[PDB]
Amino acid sequence: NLWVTVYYGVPVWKDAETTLFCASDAKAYETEKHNVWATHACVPTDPNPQEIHLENVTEEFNMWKNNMVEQMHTDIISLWDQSLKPCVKLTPLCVT
C-alpha cells in the first residue's frame, strides 16, 4: 500500500577520507619560500566563505584518528623538502 519515493537534497552524510588541498593566501611575487610553495600547490582563498550553522545535531567527533592530519603531515614534509634544502643529508637505506 505504501510506495517508495525518491528525494534529492536530503541532509545525510557519511564519513569519507578524500584528499583535500590547502588553498592559502600566497602573493606569487614573494620569495618567503612558503609563498614559493603556496603559490604552486595551493589555490587562492575564497573571500566570501560559506558557513552554515546547524540544528540540534550531535556529531561524534574524533581527534586522534583524524585523517586531515596525514594530509597535512604530507604537505609540510613536501614543503620543507623544497624550502630548506640542506647541504648534506644522511638518510639510511638498509637493504635486506
Partner: protein, 270 residues
C-alpha cells in the same frame, strides 16, 4: 641478520628566508567539513554545536618541540586533551587562553641567543594549567614540572626555526616549580647539524647569516607528558612527533561526504 648503509646526498644550499603563512585546507565539490563550535570540547565524543563550513582557519605550519608557537587560542579556559589520560605514553596537549609572548633573538660567538619571556605572564599562565590538571587528578596531589629527560637535542629543548636558522632553546628555567594545594632568559644555541623531523637522518646546513636575527612569537600551546610512578605527579614536557603540532589546530574538524539521495516510503502513486 641485516646491516645498513648510510647515503650522503648533496644539494646546492643557499640561505633562504623562511616564515610560515596561514594555510587553509578546503575540499572539492561533493564534500563538507563539519566544525565543532563547542568551547569546552574534550577533543573526542559528541560535540553539540556542530557547524558546517568548507575549510578551517589559516593554520600556520609552525614546527616546534616542547611548545606550540603562533597557534590559536582557546575561547574561555585552558583545555587539556589526550587520547587516554593515565596511559603515561600519550602526549598531553595543552592549549592556552592567553598568548605568552617570547622575544628570542641573536644580537650583534655567532651561535648565541638569549630568549626573553616574562615571569609575570608565565607564572599566571602556568598556574591556570594546574587548575585544569587537578580536575583529572584528584584535587589534592602535588604537580611538579621537571625540565626534560634525555633523548635527542630536538626533543629535550625548545627546538624551532627562525628565518632559516635552527634555534635550540634550553627551557629548564621554564618548567621548574612544584605546586601544592621579571623576565627569564633561556640559553639558545643555533645549531647546524640537526636531526630531521620528516624522516630519519641528520642534516648539515650552511653557517648562519650576518646581522641581527629576531622572531617575536606567542606561546599558545604545550606538550607535557606525565611520568606515572608510585603521591605527586611529575609533568615533564616533550614533543617531536610533528603530527601533534597540527593535531592541535585540526582538532575541531571532520570531513564528511554529502549523499543527497533519499528513499522514504509514502502513499504516492505513479
Amino acid at each position: 641478520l641485516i646491516n645498513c648503509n648510510t647515503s650522503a646526498i648533496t644539494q646546492a644550499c643557499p640561505k633562504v628566508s623562511f616564515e610560515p603563512i596561514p594555510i587553509h585546507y578546503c575540499a572539492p565539490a561533493g564534500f563538507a567539513i563539519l566544525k565543532c563550535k563547542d568551547k569546552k570540547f574534550n577533543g573526542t565524543g559528541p560535540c553539540p554545536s556542530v557547524s558546517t563550513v568548507q575549510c578551517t582557519h589559516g593554520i600556520k605550519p609552525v614546527v616546534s618541540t616542547q611548545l606550540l608557537l603562533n597557534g590559536s587560542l582557546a575561547e574561555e579556559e585552558v583545555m587539556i586533551r589526550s587520547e587516554n589520560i593515565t596511559n603515561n605514553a600519550k602526549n598531553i596537549l595543552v592549549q592556552f587562553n592567553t598568548p605568552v609572548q617570547i622575544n628570542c633573538t641573536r644580537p650583534n660567538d655567532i651561535r648565541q641567543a638569549h630568549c626573553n619571556v616574562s615571569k609575570a605572564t608565565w607564572n599566571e599562565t602556568l598556574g591556570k594549567v594546574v587548575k585544569q590538571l587537578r580536575k583529572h587528578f584528584g584535587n589534592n596531589t602535588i604537580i611538579r614540572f621537571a625540565n626534560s629527560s634525555g633523548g635527542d637535542l630536538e626533543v629535550t629543548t625548545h627546538s624551532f626555526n627562525c628565518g632559516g636558522e635552527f634555534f635550540y632553546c634550553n627551557t629548564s628555567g621554564l618548567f621548574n616549580s612544584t605546586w601544592i594545594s621579571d623576565s627569564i632568559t633561556l640559553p639558545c644555541r643555533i645549531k647546524q647539524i640537526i636531526n630531521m623531523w620528516q624522516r630519519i637522518g641528520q642534516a648539515m646546513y650552511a653557517p648562519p647569516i650576518q646581522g641581527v636575527i629576531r622572531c617575536v612569537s606567542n606561546i599558545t600551546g604545550l606538550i607535557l607528558t606525565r611520568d606515572g610512578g608510585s603521591t605527586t605527579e611529575t609533568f615533564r614536557p616533550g614533543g617531536g612527533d610533528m603530527r601533534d603540532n597540527w593535531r592541535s589546530e585540526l582538532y575541531k574538524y571532520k570531513v564528511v561526504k554529502i549523499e543527497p539521495l533519499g528513499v522514504a516510503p509514502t502513499r504516492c502513486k505513479r
